[PDB]
Amino acid sequence: ADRKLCADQECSHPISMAVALQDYMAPDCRFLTIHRGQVVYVFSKLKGRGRLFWGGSVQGDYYGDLAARLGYFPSSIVREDQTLKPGKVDVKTDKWDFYCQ
Incomplete structure (x- = not known):
């Protein structure tokens, strides 16, 4: 059971910003x-x-390749400084879980 928090209700808003530690x-x-x-x-x-x-x-x-590729990593490796999360609703992930075709 891997649930993640969303920065909104219908999942349509950014969470926050962090820096690499x-x-x-x-x-x-x-x-x-x-x-x-x-x-x-x-x-x-x-x-x-x-x-x-x-x-x-x-x-x-980067140019000639908009829309960066989201990834998954621990928080310890970074440091959240700025935030813009209007919501914090939980969202359970699916069994599938597709990544890197």
């Missing part, structure tokens, strides 16, 4: 990396069972 090269596709001095943007935090596994995306907007 150090380098953390994800395993391999399954997750995203996090290098020092690298800001991030949380979109969905999974707690109540997997607090160590949050959900969001890193800052930045």
Whole structure:
């Protein structure tokens, strides 16, 4: 049972913003990396069972490839400074769980 909190009621709003607390090269596709001095943007935090596994995306907007790829990583690897979460409703994940085709 992995439930994550949403920054709204119908899940249509950002959570907050955080910074990278150090380098953390994800395993391999399954997750995203996090290098020092690298800001991030949380979109969905999974707690109540997997607090160590949050959900969001890193800052930045590369050209010729808009819409960054969201990933999952612990909070310890980052530090939330700014916030913009209007809501905090829980959202249970599905059994499927697709990632990295």
